[PDB]
Design a protein that fits this description.
homotrimer, 297 residues, alpha/beta, Arginase, Chain A, eight-stranded parallel β-sheet, two-stranded antiparallel sheet, 10 helices, globular, binds manganese (II) ion, hydrolase, Arginase/deacetylase (a/b) fold
């Protein structure tokens, strides 16, 4: 007598679904970036609470998502991290190509590079990207060329088909972001929206501004370590300060109802660090996105 | 040289006390509702910090509670959950009957049904009830008729002597409350005060509004899982978002000084989930109620 | 490609440094005050993250601290707590005497007495002190005369060379502070700035007021249990309510740029209670002080 998210998984075939969930159970990217392992367990933890949470008809927000059809495409499987990237990008692109909405649960933030490449191919020369993250993630590769959880947006800014003017680093933190990396983003004409500015404007208002810059066909990329660890402790790099759970929910809801947002990912959920509260927040974030999506034209 | 709550337990006999604490060390109600066991340890954990916290003369709030007399009536003891309910209701009623204030520490939220029945009998046809809770708790019984932590306010709304117009669900959350259960409360003319509305108005202001609806002889029923788990992690169902510890304190203080509030309970404290920070919050909540009570005519 | 705090430890000799870190790895003071042991591990935990955190050039706040030179003078070593106090005071005074800035990481709050005595000797009859703390810490010694983490500011208020008019208890909490101890501070003409007043004014604004009272040569003494345990759980006495991590950062930044602040300590960090999130907050607090210091004339 209380239908929740699980009740929306009514599509017998993937192609019938409005939103397709794809899992990326890898954290080698995190370890390469010197982070704590654990994010490979994120998708499993997310699914666990995906089965339990989120009233489909939300009378507080006045949104009924009963009409949406969700499908779980399972995890990307590969013998190397780099092959996993290839298969993830390919999977995401196919979902985009038929006009469905792919949501990717990680796993390390390195997932965002393949995800971004899927976008750039689905909407040639017309893509926008926002990285919600306390960190810029424009670090160089490892000396042997290897990519990691800290390089995905350097990889995307280096794409010739992508305009940096439409890249926003959202809720980034000056205490954690280097002058060189700030310069790199800004020299690509990308935008830095510091945490303090987000809080001064209000999270939703600032995100609206961000969506104004990202424009059409926006990749909404959410590193959950942008949330204060008081709400979101289960990540490799716990934030002392950052977005609240409510700000996160409110932001995801906006993303959902914003017609230009064409895909979303969520990185850095680490059940080894904390396994109950954090995955629940991650699921509620997706839930708020689903509600917002329910309202879009 | 720093008298605290313990110093107020000066009443040699129960009948001399302004406020009587009653414990309900049961969590079978929680387990029946599919929750995590542990709340049966709540009263013991509460008592542990009851011995240590709360300056009797609070110079920040400018309230001296030195004149109040507290008494600990111990725990309700029974061989079944249902018998415990009977004995709890009977104990609470006797306390109400002689005009003392009963405070019941749980234990699962199922305690609120017997507590409510004590009220309805002490103030026939003139009772008000507010459920501070992220959940509505108007779930049906189990298929075999058994009651649980999720049914107490369905049980009270079904009471013929109780006017639903005077029932408030306070700080409830749309993400956790079903359309059917919202309908049930509203069809009984009960009121839904969503978390977002509480925060928009300010917690104390919204509670004043709530007390205006509940009217005379109000049962102030506080499920501590209405608090964000960042402050209150030690509950069966941890809230991602919700009331802050300060909002909770402020609310309890208001309850205390509000002459129409005739009893209080506090459910869902689960030391198995978290055993130090959460019981301390629970004690400070009671403490703030005691201070407010110290000021009432 | 991302210089952080560690990069500032470029001074080959202690005398070349603008800021000297001194460790006080003792918690016997805490245990005497009936607290939980663990703070003796604070300095080690602080150092661990001192090696990893804090962008030297902060583009969010627009402060480059690249020019500052830090030096780690190691820990004070003694066979008794009282001897450790003597050696700490002596070390701190020498640092003050040559016009450098000593920062002491504890360890129990008893460190603040020797620290205060160093100040009173470096700036005879011209010292100000602010104790950022949920507690007043003006408790009497033990019956055998022994000092503890709860007596340091009674010890300083009893100093004949120190004007109480220039003592501020900042963010103290009425629920934890006794009427007698409030009277003691106020009878010495000291000032009580309750948490509620700090939050009403805004933390930075209230601290500016406090610095106005403390005047010249101010000892900025920060007991990290003044922070809400949601952000700062790793202390002997976890606060249910209190300062946020951001308020703490903002306050430390102000302290840093305030020319009258001549030394700082930080007490009660307890890695045994919580070992990852809390030390990180402690380091970020120091970091924000360092930035502010970078801007001062
Ligand atoms: Mn990232
Ligand atoms: Mn990040
Ligand atoms: Mn409940
Ligand atoms: Mn509840
Ligand atoms: Mn202290
Ligand atoms: Mn303290």
């Amino acid at each position: 007598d209380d239908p929740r998210l699980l009740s929306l998984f009514s599509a017998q075939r993937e192609e019938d679904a409005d939103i397709v969930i794809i899992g990326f159970p890898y954290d080698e990217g995190c370890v390469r970036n010197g982070g704590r392992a654990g994010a490979k367990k994120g998708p499993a933890a997310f699914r666990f609470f995906l089965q339990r949470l989120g009233s489909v008809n939300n009378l507080e927000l006045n949104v009924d998502a009963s009409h949406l059809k969700l499908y779980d495409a399972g995890d990307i499987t590969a013998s190397t991290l780099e092959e996993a990237h290839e298969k993830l990008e390919s999977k995401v692109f196919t979902v985009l190509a038929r006009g469905a909405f792919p949501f990717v649960i990680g796993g390390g933030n390195d997932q965002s590079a393949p995800n971004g490449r899927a976008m750039l191919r689905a909407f040639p020369g017309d893509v926008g990207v926002i990285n919600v993250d306390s960190h810029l993630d424009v670090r160089p590769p490892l000396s042997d060329g290897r990519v990691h959880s800290g390089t995905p947006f350097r990889q995307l800014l280096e794409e010739s088909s992508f305009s940096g003017k439409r890249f926003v680093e959202f809720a980034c933190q000056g205490s954690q972001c280097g002058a060189l990396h700030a310069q790199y983003v800004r020299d690509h004409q990308g935008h830095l929206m510091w945490l303090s500015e987000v809080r001064k404007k209000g999270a939703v208002a600032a995100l609206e501004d961000a969506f104004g810059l990202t424009g059409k066909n926006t990749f909404f990329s959410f590193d959950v370590d942008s949330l204060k660890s008081s709400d979101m402790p289960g990540v490799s790099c716990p934030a002392a300060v950052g977005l609240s759970a409510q700000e996160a929910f409110d932001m995801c809801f906006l993303a959902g109802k914003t017609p230009t947002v064409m895909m979303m990912d969520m990185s850095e959920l680490n059940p080894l660090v904390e396994e109950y509260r954090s995955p629940r927040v991650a699921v509620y974030m997706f839930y708020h996105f689903v509600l917002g999506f329910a309202t879009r034209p």
